[PDB]
């Protein structure tokens with residue numbers, strides 16, 4: 019069944035009130051539900067059809083009378099159909115009692131058990147796995163929810179809204195009633211039951227001075243890992259107050275960590291539920307990455323609230339409207355909190371590798387897709403991250419003042435209602451008119467960012483007239499046709515630009531954002547005293563392929579002297595890409611022609627000099643430094659190479675790294691040593707609320723350099739690796755494991771770091787990732803060992819992802835020409851699909867580039883996908899995904 023965006027129609031029914039009784043027992047959960055319903059104006063005499071998946075019916079009723087199966091209703095484990103003649107024509111009550119089984123719900127959607135916690139996950143279509151409903155986001159209702167359970171096992175009971183009663187029940191049971199008066203969609207329903215321990219605090223809002231109770235919950239074992247999350251939550255509330263002027267609406271906010279979770283987290287009006295790996299940390303038991311991760315995920319779920327309780331999605335095709343906007347808000351927050359340029363760079367790095375790959379793949383879709391089969395497959399980097407860049411472009415175009423005005427308009431015009439992407443665009447259009455002082459100005463073209471798939475390519479030509487002091491930038495845009503649009507239209511592309519004086523490194527013009535609205539345009543600047551070097555797409559101002567057409571000499575100058583972090587980073591990226599493409603072709607030619615000898619173009623010496631210059635600048639940023647000594651991601655590179663031979667790419671990278679290392683290793687070593695004091699400072703190691711993003715960037719730089727030195731077998735570096743393994747910081751001692759791969763000390767550090775990791779669930783998952791990603795010739799044997807000794811038959815998605823996904827980035831080994839790596843991951847996907855289709859689809863990620871590889875590896879991957887597609891028991895999720903991915 020395929021759902022089309024253009025087919026939207028309001029329900030012929032209304033659900034005004036939901037009254038739930040959820041009774042949790044050892045081997046079953048009984049759910050009783052009364053829905054106070056009505057008939058809408060759009061009703062035309064149709065059957066009453068409820069969603070309900072996997073429910074065991076004890077009984078159903080209309081107005082307290084039992085309905086009879088076959089005669090009055092049918093149920094096929096997916097839809098409950100009540101024939102219209104038995105459906106009332108005014109306000110009526112529908113009631114049901116069903117049985118569900120969270121203890122065996124390993125798909126982690128609906129109501130399920132995670133270790134000793136019962137928790138729900140209803141977005142997007144999970145509420146129908148709990149009870150019957152018209153499970154769509156535009157069905158708004160009031161909720162009154164009662165939960166009962168064994169008191170010893172489940173002392174803490176949580177749901178949306180206010181707890182209004184707590185009571186004892188015979189047999190050592192207890193119950194709690196929660197009433198949530200404001201209307202909400204059912205995907206925001208949540209319930210939690212467990213032996214939860216917590217940290218708490220009180221927050222006083224900025225403008226109304228009201229006290230908000232903040233609680234963060236986990237199992238008792240890890241309660242000491244809750245402090246950073248609580249800090250992050252306070253930080254999020256402060257930010258939305260300061261930047262957007264928005265206060266929290268309710269009197270309490272709960273965050274709950276659970277061990278088994280399909281994604282990162284979920285917002286549920288006051289009851290936010292998190293993957294433990296995105297909420298829990300301690301300096302002793304977490305790598306540095308956890309700290310930015312918790313900050314962004316807690317922020318993200320928090321920024322969902324204000325907008326979520328005023329404007330609900332009309333339908334799921336508007337997903338990017340809530341998610342792209344919330345990621346944009348999350349990124350603004352994260353940039354302001356970390357105060358490091360690597361934060362924005364890391365978002366760009368992710369978009370241009372993972373999301374660009376997706377957008378040039380058979381899975382390519384606009385941020386507002388035209389159809390879906392399985393909602394779970396729609397939560398993509400395109401909808402989220404390209405969505406966020408589209409939301410961010412409004413800010414670039416409008417500036418802060420008018421952006422913040424269009425944002426307010428969108429709320430006002432749409433408060434209390436459902437909205438669409440057009441509603442948001444209309445609101446910004448009003449801000450655009452006010453900014454341009456022109457009520458004929460419009461953003462109608464901007465709507466193509468929602469409807470048009472594929473990554474635009476933007477290219478440049480320049481002209482300078484020295485006598486006229488006149489500089490011209492000629493710009494061209496193009497999007498490649500694909501399966502979604504035969505003809506692509508030009509987009510509204512904002513191009514933030516500067517002009518750098520090559521003679522002194524100074525800005526030559528004020529902040530300027532070119533508005534490209536045609537297929538091509540020419541932008542002319544007068545009174546330009548000398549030929550500039552253009553600094554293009556500052557801040558990465560549009561989600562596009564940038565073809566800067568600059569020389570490497572110009573790129574080096576930008577890298578050294580430009581003011582914009584992204585353009586410096588991109589200029590470096592572009593120098594590397596030119597080099598990678600050149601050496602790749604030279605290696606490829608030698609392979610194809612079976613050459614006994616051949617030449618390779620060396621790495622630009624002035625480029626190596628510039629890297630040295632930056633590394634040696636004490637005033638330059640450590641995180642930025644770690645980027646400039648790293649080649650572009652493999653998934654970024656592949657967008658530029660047809661029929662990519664992964665072996666040839668691996669030889670290419672090897673050559674380039676060795677060229678630069680042969681010149682700079684002594685520099686790397688010196689810096690690795692000199693950075694130690696500040697990077698590994700222990701002054702605040704036992705203060706869980708003290709987080710220093712610069713210091714963590716220094717550790718990133720040290721660990722990056724150590725990797726480079728280890729690969730290069732720098733004299734006596736093993737000494738440094740061994741000492742590194744003794745560091746209190748897990749980022750350090752896990753790095754010592756992965757860099758020791760090049761030495762016969764590896765399995766000793768394997769055992770040491772395992773013993774350090776095994777008693778913390780999340781830390782062990784980081785250990786697994788480190789092992790999985792290790793550059794080992796015997797990695798296949800090592801993975802087998804992990805399966806047998808550690809992973810076993812765990813159904814925890816964190817465990818499974820930890821063991822397998824990092825390995826799939828091993829360019830040389832995962833892409834083994836035998837196809838053994840493809841075969842291995844396909845076996846894991848098919849195995850996982852039996853109990854968790856959402857996670858099975860996640861494990862398909864390496865296959866997304868299948869049609870970009872050399873013809874042999876294309877065939878190998880295709881064979882595995884077709885094998886998976888032929889499994890009789892294949893889930894709808896996995897089938898849809900592989901059908902789309904293989905163009906069937």
Ligand SMILES: Nc1cccc(C(=O)N[C@@H](C(=O)NO)c2ccc(-n3cccn3)cc2)c1
Pocket residue numbers: 141142281282283284285318319322341393394395397
């Ligand atoms: N940065 C980052 C990376 C990875 C995942 C997430 C993440 O957890 N995103 C969630 C979100 O938006 N929460 O509000 C989220 C919520 C629900 C789904 N979902 C998929 C299918 C059904 N539901 C997916 C993601 C964030």
Ligand SMILES: [Mg+2]
Pocket residue numbers: 071072073074117118119
């Ligand atoms: Mg069932």
Ligand SMILES: [Zn+2]
Pocket residue numbers: 318322340341344
């Ligand atoms: Zn979200």
